[PDB]
């Protein structure tokens, strides 16, 4: 099927400042941050959009922090609570009333082993779309 038009070329998630005392215990994390991927001008005949997520992951399985902060990972989930680690895919239905598709996602920082250290948090997740 023909591809829709990518509306969300860039999406920035600013976690802001997180303190080490709130990231000391294993499993501790930051608050959830809304992130949406939107497609438009979907051609007639194209009813499904599949997003493929890809990014550098560390030994924990989550997205590796390319920043200086140690013992910190990044997690991407859909609005249903399902984790979308690197290699994961998600399929949504196209809205034929507006010819668009949307991917309501959530992003947060977390420390799997706890003991997060001072430093920066940086990570980039690439998304590629397939249509049917």
């Amino acid at each position: 099927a023909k591809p829709c038009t990518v509306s969300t070329t860039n999406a920035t998630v600013d976690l802001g400042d997180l303190y080490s005392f709130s990231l000391m215990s294993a499993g501790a994390a930051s608050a959830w941050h809304d992130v949406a991927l939107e497609l438009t001008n979907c051609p007639v005949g194209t009813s499904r959009v599949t997003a493929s997520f890809s990014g550098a992951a560390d030994s924990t399985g989550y997205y590796k922090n390319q920043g200086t902060a140690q013992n910190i990972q990044l997690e991407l989930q859909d609005d249903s609570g399902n984790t979308l680690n690197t290699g994961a895919t998600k399929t949504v239905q196209v809205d034929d009333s507006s010819q668009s598709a949307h991917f309501p996602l959530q992003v947060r920082a977390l420390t799997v082993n706890g003991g997060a250290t001072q430093g920066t948090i940086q990570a980039v997740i690439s998304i590629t779309y397939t249509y049917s």
Binding site: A11, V13, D17, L18, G67, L76, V107, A123, V124, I125
Partner: peptide, 11 residues
Amino acid sequence: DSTITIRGYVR
């Protein structure tokens, strides 16, 4: 097609 950039700091 899309890029999600995550940024922040740990104090």
